[PDB]
Structure formats: C-alpha cells, structure tokens
UniProtKB/Swiss-Prot annotation:
To M.tuberculosis Rv2632c. Pfam families: Rv2632c-like (PF08962). Transmembrane segments: none annotated. GO terms for cellular component: cytosol; plasma membrane. Induction: A member of the dormancy regulon. Induced in response to reduced oxygen tension (hypoxia), low levels of nitric oxide (NO) and carbon monoxide (CO). It is hoped that this regulon will give insight into the latent, or dormant phase of infection. Induced in C57BL/6 mouse lungs 3 weeks after low dose aerosol infection with H37Rv bacteria. InterPro entries: Rv2632c-like (IPR015057), Rv2632c-like_sf (IPR038070). It comes from the Bacteria. This is Uncharacterized protein Rv1738. Disulfide bonds: none annotated. Was identified as a high-confidence drug target.
Amino acid sequence: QSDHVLQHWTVDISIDEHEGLTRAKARLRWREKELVGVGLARLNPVPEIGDELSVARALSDLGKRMLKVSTHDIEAVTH
Ligand SMILES: [Cl-]
C-alpha cells in the first residue's frame, strides 16, 4: 500500500463584531511562515450570517494571498 504522508495545519479565525459590522482575520502559521487574510461584512445583512460572510471573505483573501506567496516561492527557485 503506497505511502500517504499526512500533516495537519490550523487556521485560527478571529471574528470581531463591532458597531454593526463584523471583521474576520484568518491566520495560518506553518513551518517558518505566517499569513493572514481579512474579510468584512454587515453584522445583519441574523448575526450568524454576518459572521459567516466575513469569514468566507477572510478565507478567500487568505487563499489568494497564499497562492501569490506560493508563486513567489516557486519563481525564487526557478528564477
Ligand atoms: Cl456585507
């Protein structure tokens, strides 16, 4: 049975509800790096819904930033 090598990383998501808006910050630490993404939403566009929307936007932002960082970590090798 050929090898499956598994690792586990965590994104910590902080959600701050203030003045009718919600700001989510998604923080990923791995190896020797850290990246953050941020998203915002109206708290009530149910406040659960504002939370979900700001987190969706934060995770999208983090993924887009991580794709750009990945690309640069590649081109730093291949020049
Ligand atoms: Cl919104």
